[PDB]
UniProtKB/Swiss-Prot annotation:
The lineage of its organism: Eukaryota, Metazoa, Chordata, Craniata, Vertebrata. Monomer. CDD domains: LYZ_C. It comes from Gallus gallus (Chicken). This is Lysozyme C. The active site is at residues 35, 52. PROSITE patterns: GLYCOSYL_HYDROL_F22_1 (PS00128), GLYCOSYL_HYDROL_F22_2 (PS51348).
């Protein structure tokens, strides 16, 4: 599923991301934009052989099982395919674990490079939520 901007913001708020670990909703929307272009089915192979899955491009090296990432972990206790669902619950729940892991949203390089410090509120502007 490719979400619209405001549709994703609303879904993210419903699932508890607004101000989660202090990160306003716009931060999460911005991260998803640059990670996946709001597409739940997005997958991208990483140089290390792991793969990123879903709207927040969660990586198989640590967070989910895809059966093809040697020496990796599955800290969210989910098949990586669960992260590709039109329902974002699994991605949100796993993202909550990631953002709690110590480095906050810097865990997403795209957030650090393209969202951090910018006017992230613009991502939820005009939305009914
Ligand atoms: Cl957009
Ligand atoms: Cl915001
Ligand atoms: Cl594996
Ligand atoms: Cl933080
Ligand atoms: Co990535
Ligand atoms: Na894994």
């Amino acid at each position: 599923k490719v979400f619209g901007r405001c549709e994703l913001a609303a879904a993210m708020k419903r699932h508890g991301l607004d101000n989660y670990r202090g990160y306003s909703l716009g931060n999460w929307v911005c991260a998803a934009k640059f990670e996946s272009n709001f597409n739940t089915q997005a997958t991208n192979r990483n140089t290390d052989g792991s793969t990123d899955y879903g709207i927040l491009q969660i990586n198989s090296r640590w967070w989910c099982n895809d059966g093809r990432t040697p020496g990796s972990r599955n800290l969210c206790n989910i098949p990586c395919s669960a992260l590709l669902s039109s329902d974002i619950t699994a991605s949100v729940n796993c993202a909550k674990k990631i953002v709690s892991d110590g480095n906050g949203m810097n865990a997403w390089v795209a957030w650090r490079n393209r969202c951090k410090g910018t006017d992230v509120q613009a991502w939820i502007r005009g939305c009914r939520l």
